[PDB]
């Protein structure tokens, strides 16, 4: 009768299936308490730990849940028995930056933020220290309210506060040196009788600071490049273009805007090639998600001019 829909903070809502395991995504949206303005920003994904797939409005979530091992087998080289899929509320990857940039809906801001925060904290955002220090300061206000000196002034910025305001990939070596500027800026949000108190203004300010990160809004895919030397990669694909991360470190390897690179289908459906326009070099990415990536690149580039 019912099914869990998660948000990227890990919370979830219970929904009623009008047509049982035949219930569509579109129905489910309407199944929850949501308008077609609100539904403009997100849809349903199905994700297990190592594969996330955006659903069409006419797909049937539960059957994809049922059919996951073969989906996994079609799309990845994972062991099927070690992944459990769940349904998620997450950003529509087609959502143009320009349209998002006008978002005023509290609910949408929240879904979008919980997702941005997850991405920030896991290391999928590369941005300079200044940017990271700003976001951390916003997280402090959001999670702990006004700066209050009695508790903080440094000594209450222990690696476990920190853990929750900076990317996990910066937290052992970079961020211990940012702790002063983080508190300074945190003091200014609380001290600012001009910048708004409210939970959705902070969340929105948070998204504002994310909008320029190159990988913002990307859907990730896993893959490999053969420089015997194999580099495991996340392929990021977004409204701005194509991005490769190291799977281990999250180090950004390359970022390419639509127009400054072209792609070719591999000889088989399990790889694709990227030719640099300026660097005049080529590389191949191996991943059984090749067809996905390539269609998302055609579709998102076409959303331009």
């Amino acid at each position: 009768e019912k099914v869990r829909i998660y948000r990227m903070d890990g919370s979830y809502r219970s929904v009623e299936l009008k047509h049982g395991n035949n219930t569509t995504v579109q129905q489910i949206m309407e199944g929850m308490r949501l308008s077609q303005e609100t539904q403009q920003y997100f849809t349903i994904w199905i994700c297990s730990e190592n594969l996330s797939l955006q659903l069409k409005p006419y797909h049937k979530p539960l059957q994809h849940v049922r059919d996951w091992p073969e989906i996994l087998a079609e799309l990845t080289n994972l062991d099927p028995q070690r992944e459990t899929p769940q349904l998620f509320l997450r950003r529509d990857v087609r959502l143009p930056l320009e349209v998002e940039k006008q978002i005023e809906d509290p609910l949408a801001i929240l879904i979008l933020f919980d997702e941005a925060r997850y991405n920030l904290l896991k290391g999928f955002y590369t941005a300079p220290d200044a940017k990271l220090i700003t976001l951390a300061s916003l997280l402090l206000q959001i999670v702990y309210g006004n700066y209050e000196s009695k508790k903080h002034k440094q000594g209450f910025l222990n690696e476990e506060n920190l853990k929750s305001i900076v990317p996990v990939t910066k937290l052992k070596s970079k961020a211990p040196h940012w702790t002063n500027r983080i508190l300074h800026e945190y003091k200014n949000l609380s001290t600012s009788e001009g910048v708004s108190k409210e939970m959705h203004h902070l969340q929105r300010m948070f998204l504002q600071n994310c909008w320029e990160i190159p990988t913002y809004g990307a859907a990730f895919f896993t893959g490999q490049i053969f420089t015997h030397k194999v580099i495991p990669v996340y392929v990021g694909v977004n409204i701005k273009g194509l991005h490769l991360l190291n799977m281990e470190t999250k180090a950004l390897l390359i970022s390419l805007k639509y127009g400054c690179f072209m792609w070719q289908l591999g000889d088989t459906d399990t790889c694709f090639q990227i030719h640099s326009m300026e660097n005049k070099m080529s590389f191949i990415v191996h991943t059984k998600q090749a067809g996905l990536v390539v269609k998302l690149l055609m579709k998102l580039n076409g959303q331009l001019m």
Partner: peptide, 7 residues
């Protein structure tokens, strides 16, 4: 055709 086109 339909059940395998994501995104």
């Amino acid at each position: 055709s339909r059940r395998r086109d994501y995104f």
